[PDB]
Motif scaffolding. Structure first.
Motif, PDB file in Angstrom:
ATOM      1  N   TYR A 166       0.557  -1.319   0.142  1.00  0.00           N
ATOM      2  CA  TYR A 166       0.334   0.334   0.325  1.00  0.00           C
ATOM      3  C   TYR A 166       0.789   1.280   0.489  1.00  0.00           C
ATOM      4  CZ  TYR A 166      -3.975  -3.562   1.277  1.00  0.00           C
ATOM      5  OH  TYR A 166      -4.644  -4.375   1.284  1.00  0.00           O
ATOM      6  N   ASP A 167       0.489   2.121  -0.821  1.00  0.00           N
ATOM      7  CA  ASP A 167       0.466   3.760  -0.223  1.00  0.00           C
ATOM      8  C   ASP A 167       0.015   4.470   0.331  1.00  0.00           C
ATOM      9  OD1 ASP A 167      -0.089   5.570  -3.267  1.00  0.00           O
ATOM     10  OD2 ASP A 167      -0.289   3.675  -3.383  1.00  0.00           O
ATOM     11  N   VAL A 168       0.219   5.355   0.857  1.00  0.00           N
ATOM     12  CA  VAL A 168      -0.098   6.423   1.964  1.00  0.00           C
ATOM     13  C   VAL A 168       0.030   7.815   2.022  1.00  0.00           C
ATOM     14  CG1 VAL A 168      -0.934   6.638   3.993  1.00  0.00           C
ATOM     15  CG2 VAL A 168      -1.051   4.035   3.019  1.00  0.00           C
ATOM     16  N   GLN A 169      -1.165   8.554   1.478  1.00  0.00           N
ATOM     17  CA  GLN A 169      -0.919  10.538   1.350  1.00  0.00           C
ATOM     18  C   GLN A 169      -1.725  10.658   2.611  1.00  0.00           C
ATOM     19  OE1 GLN A 169      -0.843  10.059  -2.756  1.00  0.00           O
ATOM     20  NE2 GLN A 169       0.509  11.582  -2.908  1.00  0.00           N
ATOM     21  N   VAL A 170      -1.018  11.586   2.918  1.00  0.00           N
ATOM     22  CA  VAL A 170      -1.670  12.945   3.898  1.00  0.00           C
ATOM     23  C   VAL A 170      -2.160  13.971   3.044  1.00  0.00           C
ATOM     24  CG1 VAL A 170      -2.757  13.127   6.332  1.00  0.00           C
ATOM     25  CG2 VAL A 170      -1.263  11.812   5.810  1.00  0.00           C
ATOM     26  N   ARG A 171      -3.642  15.044   3.506  1.00  0.00           N
ATOM     27  CA  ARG A 171      -3.643  16.172   2.419  1.00  0.00           C
ATOM     28  C   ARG A 171      -4.320  16.940   3.922  1.00  0.00           C
ATOM     29  NH1 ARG A 171      -8.837  16.516  -1.872  1.00  0.00           N
ATOM     30  NH2 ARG A 171      -8.212  18.451  -2.878  1.00  0.00           N
ATOM     31  N   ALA A 172      -4.019  18.278   3.685  1.00  0.00           N
ATOM     32  CA  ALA A 172      -4.496  19.213   4.724  1.00  0.00           C
ATOM     33  C   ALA A 172      -4.970  20.889   4.604  1.00  0.00           C
ATOM     34  CB  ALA A 172      -3.225  19.719   5.449  1.00  0.00           C
ATOM     35  N   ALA A 173      -6.018  21.061   5.185  1.00  0.00           N
ATOM     36  CA  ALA A 173      -6.779  22.471   4.984  1.00  0.00           C
ATOM     37  C   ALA A 173      -7.574  22.708   5.876  1.00  0.00           C
ATOM     38  CB  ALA A 173      -7.591  21.757   3.793  1.00  0.00           C
ATOM     39  N   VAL A 174      -7.563  23.685   6.178  1.00  0.00           N
ATOM     40  CA  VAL A 174      -7.998  24.331   7.588  1.00  0.00           C
ATOM     41  C   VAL A 174      -9.426  24.095   7.998  1.00  0.00           C
ATOM     42  CG1 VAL A 174      -8.290  26.602   8.688  1.00  0.00           C
ATOM     43  CG2 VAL A 174      -6.341  26.099   7.224  1.00  0.00           C
ATOM     44  N   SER A 175     -10.301  23.784   8.921  1.00  0.00           N
ATOM     45  CA  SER A 175     -11.067  22.813   8.803  1.00  0.00           C
ATOM     46  C   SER A 175     -12.283  24.357   8.389  1.00  0.00           C
ATOM     47  CB  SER A 175     -11.385  22.798  10.415  1.00  0.00           C
ATOM     48  OG  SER A 175     -12.849  22.183  10.805  1.00  0.00           O
ATOM     49  N   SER A 176     -13.598  24.027   8.345  1.00  0.00           N
ATOM     50  CA  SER A 176     -14.469  25.272   8.223  1.00  0.00           C
ATOM     51  C   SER A 176     -14.969  26.193   9.025  1.00  0.00           C
ATOM     52  CB  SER A 176     -15.705  24.760   7.407  1.00  0.00           C
ATOM     53  OG  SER A 176     -15.679  23.052   6.674  1.00  0.00           O
ATOM     54  N   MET A 177     -14.235  25.608  10.510  1.00  0.00           N
ATOM     55  CA  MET A 177     -14.741  25.849  11.944  1.00  0.00           C
ATOM     56  C   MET A 177     -13.854  27.088  12.669  1.00  0.00           C
ATOM     57  SD  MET A 177     -17.665  25.484  13.223  1.00  0.00           S
ATOM     58  CE  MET A 177     -17.075  26.331  14.555  1.00  0.00           C
ATOM     59  N   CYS A 178     -12.785  27.000  12.315  1.00  0.00           N
ATOM     60  CA  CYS A 178     -11.920  28.202  12.399  1.00  0.00           C
ATOM     61  C   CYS A 178     -11.728  29.342  11.279  1.00  0.00           C
ATOM     62  CB  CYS A 178     -10.246  27.446  12.584  1.00  0.00           C
ATOM     63  SG  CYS A 178     -10.228  26.486  13.237  1.00  0.00           S
ATOM     64  N   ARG A 179     -11.519  29.331   9.490  1.00  0.00           N
ATOM     65  CA  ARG A 179     -11.730  29.597   8.934  1.00  0.00           C
ATOM     66  C   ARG A 179     -12.880  29.438   8.136  1.00  0.00           C
ATOM     67  NH1 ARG A 179      -5.845  32.454   6.532  1.00  0.00           N
ATOM     68  NH2 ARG A 179      -6.154  30.137   5.934  1.00  0.00           N
ATOM     69  N   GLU A 180     -13.107  30.319   6.849  1.00  0.00           N
ATOM     70  CA  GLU A 180     -13.836  29.804   5.659  1.00  0.00           C
ATOM     71  C   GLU A 180     -12.740  29.185   4.552  1.00  0.00           C
ATOM     72  OE1 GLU A 180     -16.533  32.958   3.192  1.00  0.00           O
ATOM     73  OE2 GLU A 180     -17.039  32.308   4.020  1.00  0.00           O
ATOM     74  N   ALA A 181     -13.964  28.319   3.959  1.00  0.00           N
ATOM     75  CA  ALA A 181     -13.417  27.128   2.933  1.00  0.00           C
ATOM     76  C   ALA A 181     -12.059  28.251   2.436  1.00  0.00           C
ATOM     77  CB  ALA A 181     -14.618  26.642   2.359  1.00  0.00           C
ATOM     78  N   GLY A 182     -10.935  26.866   2.717  1.00  0.00           N
ATOM     79  CA  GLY A 182     -10.050  27.916   1.687  1.00  0.00           C
ATOM     80  C   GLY A 182      -9.469  26.554   0.706  1.00  0.00           C
TER      81      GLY A 182
END
Lengths: 307, 109, 107
Positions: free
Chosen positions: A278-294
């Motif tokens: 298996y190969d694994v990747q992770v992806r990050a974004a600031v939650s919609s709970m602190c700021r507006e969607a980015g």
């Protein structure tokens, strides 16, 4: 017995990049103030808006490269009636120059890094801006970049250039931009030529829209026999920990079976086989709970695990 | 009936009923001209009240305005927690350094 | 005189005159159990004002309480700014959403 008189001495002055102050004074000829008057501001150009204020001045954040036009009323309201005076108007004429003299496609990007050079503050914020020259842009013309966040303004000093030595891109390793900031980023690209007039260009950016999020860090995947164990770290940003959205992608390199989980926790475990890689990747974004969607971060470097 | 996850579900509610709420185009509600949000709880929740006293108490809308009302009394709770515990001089000055430090670092001025 | 410079100055003076203000142990002033400072500006400056009426404004002790006075005036201006303008519902909700995002970020 009241006839509403419009306000007087209505001014508009530029107080900074993409920032004007509307100012007026109550009509002294208005019958002796025994009732509380208010005002209605109307913005005619370039973007329409209208609102009320109890005082005699108002800051408006707006682009200026198209000119600006506003109007102000006197309003008197109870419940029985509403009275509105005639309009007192004022306008800032559009900058001199030809349409094709302006830059094209202004794109800016902010990124957060760790500040070790300075114990004074946590995290740096960088600014990278690109643009095109223009079809009717002269061969001798030059461009100048300026930005503003809050009350601070800076001119660019790191220009990338094209064939003709005219500026086409900018770079700020350090800015006044707050990493958890929630105000506009006003950017200004001005021009100059001895043989023509150049129309400038400004733009308002929201940080949540231009902030390139860094990837999750220390992404590791362990195989303990029949299960997968994945962990990473909340990326280099000023945002805490309870404010991140993550996607973790587990790809079966054998048959192509796919599983993606959108989560906020910093670790993940699931079933697999002892059989496949298996190969694994992770992806990050600031939650919609602190700021507006980015924006999402890039996927982490693919960590191939198992066999 | 918790709190720390109210906002998550509350914000998500505001993301949907926005088009319904902004249908009233004559209504003018106080909006602070600065970005120091926590200084303006009285005006924000007074605005929420006016916006409530002018909205069709629908289905998934009516919940939003209680969740906002619930958040208020958590804030109303924190408010009285600012000044009902008298402590020793100078724990007060210790608190004051942090306060002025935050205003220096965090706040926009 | 500019507010940013005022705070930087006031902080320094505050650390110098620590022991001086420490005196009265009978004095009991409310101190918040959380660090949401912006809720407690009324409480803080009530605690400030119960020192100016008890300490001696002699040396640069007087400059401290005067700076804190000016800081109070700045903050009072910010609160006045909370409801000076009344805007469209869509702009209010933008602020409310931005408000709730800060609470979450800062907790």
């Amino acid at each position: 017995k009241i006839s509403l008189l419009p306000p007087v001495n209505f001014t508009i002055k530029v107080t900074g990049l993409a920032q004007v102050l509307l100012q007026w004074k109550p009509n002294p000829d208005q019958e002796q103030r025994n009732v509380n008057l208010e005002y209605q501001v109307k913005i005619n150009a370039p973007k329409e808006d209208d609102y009320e204020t109890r005082i005699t001045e108002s800051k408006c954040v707006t682009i200026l490269h198209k000119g600006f036009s506003a109007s102000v009323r006197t309003i008197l309201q109870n419940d029985h009636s509403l009275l509105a005076s005639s309009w007192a108007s004022a306008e800032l004429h559009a900058p001199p120059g030809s349409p094709g003299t302006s830059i094209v496609n202004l794109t800016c990007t902010t990124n957060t890094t760790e500040d070790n050079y300075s114990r004074l503050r946590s995290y740096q914020v960088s600014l990278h801006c690109t643009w095109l020259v223009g079809t009717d842009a002269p061969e001798d013309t030059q461009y100048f970049l300026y930005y503003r966040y809050g009350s601070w303004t800076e001119e660019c000093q790191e220009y990338s250039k094209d064939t003709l030595g005219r500026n086409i891109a900018c770079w700020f390793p350090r800015t006044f931009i707050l990493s958890k900031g929630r105000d506009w980023l006003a950017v200004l690209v001005n021009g100059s030529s001895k043989h023509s007039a150049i129309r400038p260009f400004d733009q308002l950016f929201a940080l949540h829209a231009i902030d390139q999020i860094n990837p999750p860090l220390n992404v590791t995947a362990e195989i303990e026999g029949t299960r997968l164990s994945i962990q990473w770290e909340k990326p280099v940003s000023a945002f805490p920990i309870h404010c991140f959205d993550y996607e973790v992608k587990i790809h079966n390199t054998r048959n192509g079976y796919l599983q993606i989980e959108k989560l906020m926790t910093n670790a993940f475990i699931s079933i697999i086989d002892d059989l496949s890689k298996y190969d694994v990747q992770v992806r990050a974004a600031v939650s919609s709970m602190c700021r507006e969607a980015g924006l999402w971060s890039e996927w982490s470097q693919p960590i191939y695990v198992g066999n | 009936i918790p709190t720390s996850a109210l906002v998550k579900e509350t914000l998500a509610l505001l993301s949907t009923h926005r088009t319904l709420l902004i249908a009233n185009e004559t209504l003018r509600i106080p909006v602070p001209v600065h970005k120091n949000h926590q200084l303006c709880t009285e005006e924000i929740f007074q605005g929420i009240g006016t916006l409530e006293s002018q909205t069709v108490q629908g289905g998934t809308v009516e919940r939003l305005f209680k969740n906002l009302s619930l958040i208020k009394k958590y804030i109303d709770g924190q408010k009285k927690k600012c000044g009902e515990e008298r402590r020793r001089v100078n724990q007060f000055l210790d608190y004051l350094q942090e306060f002025l430090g935050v205003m220096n670092t965090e706040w926009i001025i």
